Ligand binder design. Structure first.
Ligand SMILES: Nc1ncnc2c1ncn2[C@@H]1O[C@H](COP(=O)(O)OP(=O)(O)OP(O)(O)=S)[C@@H](O)[C@H]1O
Ligand SMILES: Nc1ncnc2c1ncn2[C@@H]1O[C@H](COP(=O)(O)OP(=O)(O)OP(O)(O)=S)[C@@H](O)[C@H]1O
Lengths: 106, 373, 425, 52
């Protein structure tokens, strides 16, 4: 498994060699591989040239965002709530959290 | 039928008669004429001198005259190293091959006092090397100086493509100095000396080579822009396999590869009528002769399609794919040009190989682009 | 060679070979050709003559990537092993420095390792001295041309020696390459063979798919109903609708004519039906099946459709507040490139030109302080460095570098109309 | 409202696989469904961007 952070900087103008070798390893190698590019430059596909993009399997996946106000409210509830029993305070602590969270005027 | 044409693909020239006059002292062991042999490219000129020296060495007295190719040096030392390789000896090499005066000590022979002439092959790599009046012209200057007192002189035979090199010489050197004067050129042989060598290179003759007047026809209608008729027989050797594949026919096959899409096959590239619309959209953005982005084109594409409602406005992502359909046929090229704000940042500037004269014919047949013009 | 013995491990716990697993095994891009059938001979008959006659020639082929020129010349030499040569894949892009290919050649004649200087001396010493057979592939020639053409002159000057036992095969990106990058002195040595490779056509793009689908199209699998494992309890079949394969062909031949792009869009569309089949029954990982036309409709569109429009409407408020200010200056001035201080000048002004609407006031409270009437009176807005950094690394915006944080110019990077259009939501 | 109508075209493309420019027997399966002659008229021009 390949883990690539900031694969856009490898996608420079001049050489692009290292991308070209791993993407051809998809095509021919008996060793099963998988490549994982992580970046933040959105239109990553135009940054590549022609001969590398044809090696590429073209499948990108966009990462989601918090699209509604209710979503992160649901997230912070799952974030702060403890579910496993450790402390005597826990059952008291869990209902204090949501009571602040359920009230929209809190 | 193969072995007659298996052998097809492989003193002799009427330019060798010139150079024996130019080497008139090379059989009397004296210093010959002053040899700076130039030429327009492809004219056989690399192998031309190689034909002479190989005929010289196979003919010729102690025999040692060496020739080295100036390709991978960029620097005038190891040429004087390679003349030492015909000696098969051992010495202190570095100082003797570096300075002008250090070459002079190297020119005292050992066995029988046969004079030496060097041959500098492909001198234009050092001519068209690093900056002229600093190193390379000085390198040119230092080699052509033959003021040595005995007749054992390092006679140069150097070669070049483009004929600017004589005017590059300093006015002292152009005062009849060294190997200068005989600027022996070689005009490209139309058919009148090169084809006849092909005749004698058909010593082993098959029955059906083909009609040799068509070979004469091949020579006459290649001599517009050419220099190498064996290589232009190597395009006959490809068409001679065409008559083997099918168990100037090929120049006809190769030019229609190049002439078309502007006259006829433009509409072949744009079977989509929207591809006809997007092709005129590029040229309307070319009024602002700027870095024609895929966005500024998309800017003029939307603001016109809202006025005339010929189609719905499509996506930028669709606009990405459709202009690449225009790309692979060879009409418009895309390059990542320069904008220098943060880093060397690459916006894409396009360029079209069509003219408005070859545009206006193919749009008056379609009155749906006529709103757009 | 060595370590492939060490790349093997033992415990392989019975991986489920489902219905669409055996498709992707042959839909792998590895394993006579229909499309470039006769041009294979045009290479080979150009190559067969020089091979069995001990000469030195040059063969120049061009074309867009995805047309088989990586493939076809491998099929040339492959049959030739049956009937004197040393095969080398001198790739251009697989060389780190351009001179490093010189090391390979001198390595691949005797087995020695010197520098690129010392190799090409003995290479030149080889190519004009040996009494009398080398096949070399100079792939992706855009890489090895870049510096000063001194490398490229060597690779064809070796061909000129009549005593040179070498056969070169150049494969480029464009036919134009010895006319817009090289000199004419190289262009004399390149010859005028110039075998052009076009794209593929959509009829042949059907004829390339079924070569992978030879023994598996409309065939039968043996399946247990409990695990989803398929074997070449039911005995099920799986069919491929050829019209959807056709509409895959009529697009890829239209835009690119690329043989990887045709296979991979079928490969992407194959796994869409894989997860929907796993969704309905859940066999995990431990009557008659098909692939609809609706799969390749999505996956071909999945090559096209974006998200920056969906990204922009799912951004923050002050992000959408930022761009709406930025288009306001671009229609005020018509200069498409505005100074950064004027934007901060505008977002101040775009507060009070709207009325005293309490939503704007609940914005304007929050826009300059996170509540907390203690700490207030902020000049520029809250997280203004943050959203401008967030719009920068997203690729939507672009900002030139200056230590002045007022007169540094800002330029848009996507089309401003779609920025105007996505703002409307 | 337009994802389905591509597939009835695919049912024709199953039948003969013809990309005709003007229609008399493609439109005949549309009027029995509920959509007018104008909606399909736009569908001719916009699927030209699909090169089908
Ligand atoms: N008149 C000729 N006689 C014998 N062989 C010839 C003749 N003309 C051409 N050839 C051969 O065909 C080749 C074509 O010439 P090129 O080598 O391509 O050009 P050139 O010899 O490099 O001269 P340049 O381009 O100015 S360096 C020669 O090298 C010879 O092998
Ligand atoms: N006619 C064909 N028959 C069978 N498989 C093919 C055919 N054409 C291409 N392929 C496959 O598709 C792949 C595409 O690679 P190629 O087209 O050979 O490379 P390419 O055209 O040189 O593109 P490059 O290497 O980036 S310049 C091949 O490796 C084969 O697996």
């Amino acid at each position: 498994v390949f883990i690539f952070d900031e694969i856009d900087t490898f996608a420079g103008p001049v050489r692009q060699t290292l991308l070209y070798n791993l993407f051809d390893m998809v095509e021919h190698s008996r060793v099963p591989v998988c490549i994982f590019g992580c970046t933040t430059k959105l239109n990553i596909l135009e940054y590549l040239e022609k001969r590398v993009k044809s090696r590429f399997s073209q499948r990108v996946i966009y990462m989601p965002q918090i699209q509604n106000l209710d979503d992160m409210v649901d997230a912070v509830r799952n974030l702060l709530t403890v579910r496993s029993e450790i402390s005597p305070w826990v059952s008291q602590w869990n209902e204090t959290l949501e009571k602040e969270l359920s009230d929209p005027r809190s | 039928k193969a072995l007659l044409q298996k052998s097809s693909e492989l003193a002799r020239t009427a330019e060798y008669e010139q150079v024996m006059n130019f080497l008139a002292k090379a059989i009397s062991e004296h210093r010959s004429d002053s040899l700076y042999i130039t030429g327009p490219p492809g004219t056989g000129k690399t192998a031309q001198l190689d034909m002479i020296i190989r005929q010289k060495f196979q003919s010729l007295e102690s025999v040692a005259v060496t020739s080295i190719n100036c390709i991978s040096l960029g620097e005038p030392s190891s040429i004087f190293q390679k003349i030492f390789d015909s000696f098969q000896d051992l010495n202190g090499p570095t100082l003797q091959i570096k300075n002008m005066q250090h070459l002079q000590k190297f020119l005292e022979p050992y066995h029988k006092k046969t004079t030496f002439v060097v041959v500098l092959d492909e001198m234009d790599r050092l001519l068209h090397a690093n900056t002229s009046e600093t190193q390379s012209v000085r390198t040119i200057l230092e080699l052509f100086l033959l003021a040595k007192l005995p007749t054992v002189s390092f006679v140069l035979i150097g070669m070049a493509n483009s004929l600017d090199m004589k005017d590059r010489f300093l006015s002292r050197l152009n005062l009849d100095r060294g190997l200068l004067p005989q600027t022996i050129v070689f005009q490209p042989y139309t058919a009148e000396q090169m084809y006849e060598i092909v005749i004698q290179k058909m010593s082993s003759l098959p029955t059906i080579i083909f009609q040799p007047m068509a070979i004469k026809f091949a020579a006459k209608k290649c001599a517009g822009n050419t220099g190498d008729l064996r290589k232009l027989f190597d395009v006959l050797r490809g068409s001679i396999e065409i008559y083997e594949l099918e168990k100037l026919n090929y120049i006809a096959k190769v030019f229609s590869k190049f002439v078309n899409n502007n006259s006829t096959r433009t509409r072949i590239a744009k079977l989509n009528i929207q591809q006809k619309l997007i092709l005129c959209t590029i040229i309307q953005s070319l009024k602002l002769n700027s870095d024609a982005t895929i966005d500024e084109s998309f800017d003029h594409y939307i603001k016109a399609i809202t006025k005339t409602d010929t189609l719905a406005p499509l996506q930028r992502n669709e606009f990405l794919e459709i202009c690449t359909i225009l790309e692979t046929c060879g009409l418009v090229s895309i390059k990542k040009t320069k904008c220098k704000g943060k880093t060397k940042r690459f916006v894409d500037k396009i360029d079209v190989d069509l003219d408005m004269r070859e545009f206006y014919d193919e749009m008056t047949k379609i009155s749906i682009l006529k709103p757009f013009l | 060679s060595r370590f492939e013995n060490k790349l093997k491990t033992t415990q392989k716990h019975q991986i489920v070979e489902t219905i669409f697993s055996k498709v992707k095994k042959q839909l792998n891009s590895s394993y006579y050709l229909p499309a470039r059938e006769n041009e294979f001979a045009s290479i080979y008959l150009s190559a067969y003559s020089a091979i069995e006659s001990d000469s030195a020639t040059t063969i120049y082929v061009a074309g867009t990537p995805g047309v088989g020129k990586t493939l076809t010349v491998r099929e040339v030499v492959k049959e030739l092993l049956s009937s004197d040569f040393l095969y080398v894949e001198i790739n251009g892009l697989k060389m780190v420095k351009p001179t490093d290919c010189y090391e390979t050649l001198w390595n691949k004649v005797s087995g020695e390792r010197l520098t690129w200087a010392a190799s090409m001396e003995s290479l030149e010493f080889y190519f004009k001295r040996v009494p009398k057979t080398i096949v070399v592939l100079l792939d992706e020639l855009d890489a090895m041309v870049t510096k000063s053409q001194d490398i490229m002159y060597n690779f064809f000057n070796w061909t000129t020696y009549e005593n040179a036992k070498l056969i070169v095969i150049a494969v480029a990106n464009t036919m134009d390459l010895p006319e817009r990058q090289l000199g004419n002195k190289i262009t004399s040595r390149i010859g005028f063979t110039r075998i052009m490779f076009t794209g593929y056509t959509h009829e042949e793009l059907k004829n390339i798919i079924d070569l992978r689908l030879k023994g598996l199209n409309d065939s039968f699998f043996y399946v247990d109903t409990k695990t989803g494992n398929a074997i070449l309890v039911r005995k099920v079949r799986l069919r491929m609708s050829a019209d959807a394969i056709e509409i895959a062909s009529r697009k890829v031949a239209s835009v690119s004519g690329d043989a990887r792009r045709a296979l991979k869009v079928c490969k992407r569309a194959a796994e869409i039906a894989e997860k929907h089949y796993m969704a309905k029954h859940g066999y995990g990982y431990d009557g008659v099946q098909t692939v609809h036309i609706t799969h390749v409709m999505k996956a071909l569109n999945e090559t096209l459709n974006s998200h920056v429009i969906t990204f922009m409407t799912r951004l923050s408020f002050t992000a959408k507040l930022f761009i709406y200010a930025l288009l306001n200056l671009m229609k005020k001035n018509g200069s498409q490139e505005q100074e950064l201080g004027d934007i901060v000048d505008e977002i101040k002004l775009l507060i009070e030109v709207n009325g005293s609407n309490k939503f704007v006031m609940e914005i304007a409270k929050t826009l300059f302080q996170q509540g907390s009437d203690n700490i207030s009176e902020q000049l520029r807005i809250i997280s203004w460095d943050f959203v401008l950094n967030q719009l920068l690394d997203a690729g939507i915006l672009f900002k030139q570098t200056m230590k002045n944080d007022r007169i540094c110019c800002v330029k848009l990077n996507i089309s401003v109309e779609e920025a105007k259009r996505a703002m409307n939501e | 409202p337009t994802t389905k109508i591509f597939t009835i075209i695919k049912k024709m493309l199953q039948e003969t696989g013809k990309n005709t420019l003007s229609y008399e027997n493609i439109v005949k399966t549309v009027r029995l469904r509920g959509f007018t002659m104008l909606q399909l008229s736009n569908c001719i021009q916009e699927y030209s961007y699909l090169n089908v």
